[PDB]
Amino acid sequence: TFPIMSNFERDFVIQLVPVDTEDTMDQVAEKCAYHSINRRVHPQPEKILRVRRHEDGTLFPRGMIVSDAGLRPTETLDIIFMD
């Protein structure tokens, strides 16, 4: 358990999303979408949800876990659309 701030692509607002220290970027992404997709952002299923540290554009590989990301509690992360 680990809070992060979710900056979801094409949404107007940063939100608080509790994640797990053991989640994959993929599973972070999916926890974030829950609060964005079909609320304020149209799904994109030609697309793949990716995670980059907000402060400096660093893109995290899909399957890296939070534990290893070296995040600061409450750190802000872009949840973006790629392929």
Interacting residue ranges for other proteins, rule: CB under 8 A: 3, 5, 7, 9-17, 34-35, 38-42, 54-55, 72-76
CA distance 71 to 48: 22
Q: How far apart are CA 72 and CA 67, in angstroms?
A: 11
CB of 48 to other proteins, least distance (A): 17
The residue to which tokens 């995670």 are assigned? 51
Side chain identity at residue 21, one-letter code: T
Which residue, 18 or 63, is less far from other proteins as judged by CB?
18
Q: How far is the CB of 60 from other proteins (least distance, A)?
A: 17
Compare residues 3 and 61 and give the one whose CB is closer to other proteins.
3
Nearer to other proteins, 38 or 67 (CB): 38
Handedness of CA 63, 66, 67, 69 (dihedral sign): positive
Report in angstroms how near the CB of residue 5 gets to other proteins at its nearest. Answer: 5
Backbone angles phi and psi of 59, in degrees to 5: -90, 130
